[PDB]
């Protein structure tokens, strides 16, 4: 027969904040902290009675909107203090942090530059769970200038899948990350949006809180998590700048000593050890599709027609040199094929072949 709190439904933001940072849950990433706020939020809309794991022990919570009078209960309502919750809860030392936090908005809220100057000295007032919790706070004002901090760390997780090899790309720098958060954390502009999009942008955080996996497909590289959320349009512009880029050998997109092909990305490299001086093979880069296959040995009989045929590539087939360049080339039926080939890996870019005609 513990006391049920009953707390409104409709409690603002900020309140609602220094209620949740009660909260014992140690969060893994931006990812759990996402997960476990989202958790509670929904908890409270749905009214019925529900645990709340704090660090002044267990309570129990329940949202409410009309209290039906009578058995004295008690109530978080709309126009509690940080005071009204003290005494129920006893204190939190992070939510007087908080409560501190929100008595100098006034000062780093400012301009741009005073939201970043807040962002980037945030540790020396919370340690790395707090900070992720405001990372997840309700109030507009205070998780925008939090994430702010999100964008070095995911620029970064960027650069590092891309690898070394990569860097002369990562130059799509100002156009690209720096805009597209500045765009979609921008706290000035298009207000009475802002709700909305600080709202897409905790989902894209957490999106891509755990990894960042960069694959090829349809000829761009393409950051996995950033696909399905407000971040696309790094995907976006990074895919417009590969359309624009030259058509090349077997019909990839050429930029630099690299190619793009349908699915992977591999180093041309001139002259491959172990062939004709001037012969030039793939060697894939990061994450690629393809089938593994068995090259039984050179043979020289066969011509590259310019033309795709959309079909498995055989696991077993032979090295030949089309075009300069070393490939893998199968049989299928009557028929054969020539494929970009890397060691003892096949791309999926097949192309038709003729066996050559005598006088």
């Given at each position: 027969?513990?006391?049920?709190?009953?707390?409104?439904?409709?409690?603002?933001?900020?309140?609602?904040?220094?209620?949740?940072?009660?909260?014992?849950?140690?969060?893994?990433?931006?990812?759990?902290?996402?997960?476990?706020?989202?958790?509670?939020?929904?908890?409270?809309?749905?009214?019925?009675?529900?645990?709340?794991?704090?660090?002044?022990?267990?309570?129990?919570?329940?949202?409410?909107?009309?209290?039906?009078?009578?058995?004295?209960?008690?109530?978080?309502?709309?126009?509690?203090?940080?005071?009204?919750?003290?005494?129920?809860?006893?204190?939190?030392?992070?939510?007087?942090?908080?409560?501190?936090?929100?008595?100098?908005?006034?000062?780093?809220?400012?301009?741009?530059?005073?939201?970043?100057?807040?962002?980037?000295?945030?540790?020396?007032?919370?340690?790395?769970?707090?900070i992720l919790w405001?990372?997840?706070?309700?109030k507009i004002q205070?998780?925008?200038?939090?994430?702010?901090?999100?964008?070095?760390?995911?620029?970064?997780?960027?650069?590092?899948?891309?690898?070394?090899?990569?860097?002369?790309?990562?130059?799509?720098?100002?156009?690209?990350?720096?805009?597209?958060?500045?765009?979609?954390?921008?706290?000035?502009?298009?207000?009475?949006?802002?709700?909305?999009?600080?709202?897409?942008?905790?989902?894209?955080?957490?999106?891509?809180?755990?990894?960042?996996?960069?694959?090829?497909?349809?000829?761009?590289?393409?950051?996995?998590?950033?696909?399905?959320?407000?971040?696309?349009?790094?995907?976006?512009?990074?895919?417009?700048?590969?359309?624009?880029?030259?058509?090349?050998?077997?019909?990839?997109?050429?930029?630099?000593?690299?190619?793009?092909?349908?699915?992977?990305?591999?180093?041309?490299?001139?002259?491959?050890?172990?062939?004709?001086?001037?012969?030039?093979?793939?060697?894939?880069?990061?994450?690629?599709?393809?089938?593994?296959?068995?090259?039984?040995?050179?043979?020289?009989?066969?011509?590259?027609?310019?033309?795709?045929?959309?079909?498995?590539?055989?696991?077993?087939?032979?090295?030949?040199?089309?075009?300069?360049?070393?490939?893998?080339?199968?049989?299928?039926?009557?028929?054969?094929?020539?494929?970009?080939?890397?060691?003892?890996?096949?791309?999926?870019?097949?192309?038709?072949?003729?066996?050559?005609?005598?006088?």
């Open positions: 027969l513990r006391d049920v709190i009953l707390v409104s439904k409709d409690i603002p933001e900020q309140l609602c904040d220094a209620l949740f940072f009660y909260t014992s849950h140690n969060p893994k990433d931006y990812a759990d902290a996402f997960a476990v706020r989202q958790k509670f939020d929904r908890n409270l809309q749905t009214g019925k009675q529900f645990k709340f794991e704090t660090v002044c022990g267990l309570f129990l919570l329940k949202g409410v909107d009309k209290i039906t009078p009578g058995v004295p209960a008690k109530v978080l309502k709309a126009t509690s203090k940080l005071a009204d919750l003290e005494d129920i809860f006893g204190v939190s030392p992070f939510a007087r942090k908080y409560r501190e936090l929100l008595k100098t908005a006034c000062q780093w809220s400012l301009t741009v530059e005073t939201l970043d100057a807040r962002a980037l000295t945030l540790d020396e007032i919370f340690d790395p769970t707090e405001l990372q997840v706070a309700a205070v998780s925008a200038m939090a994430m702010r901090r999100l964008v070095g760390e995911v620029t970064a997780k960027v650069m590092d899948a891309l690898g070394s090899n990569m860097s002369a790309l990562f130059q799509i720098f100002k156009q690209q990350i720096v805009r597209i958060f500045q765009a979609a954390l921008a706290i000035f502009e298009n207000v009475s949006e802002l709700p909305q999009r600080i709202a897409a942008l905790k989902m894209a955080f957490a999106k891509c809180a755990k990894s960042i996996t960069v694959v090829v497909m349809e000829r761009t590289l393409v950051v996995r998590e950033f696909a399905g959320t407000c971040l696309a349009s790094i995907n976006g512009a990074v895919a417009k700048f590969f359309e624009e880029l030259p058509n090349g050998f077997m019909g990839a997109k050429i930029f630099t000593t690299f190619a793009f092909f349908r699915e992977a990305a591999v180093k041309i490299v001139d002259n491959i050890p172990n062939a004709p001086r001037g012969t030039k093979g793939f060697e894939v880069v990061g994450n690629a599709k393809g089938t593994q296959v068995v090259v039984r040995g050179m043979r020289n009989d066969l011509t590259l027609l310019d033309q795709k045929a959309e079909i498995p590539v055989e696991s077993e087939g032979w090295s030949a040199i089309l075009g300069g360049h070393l490939c893998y080339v199968f049989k299928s039926g009557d028929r054969f094929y020539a494929a970009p080939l890397s060691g003892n890996f096949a791309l999926h870019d097949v192309h038709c072949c003729e066996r050559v005609v005598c006088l």
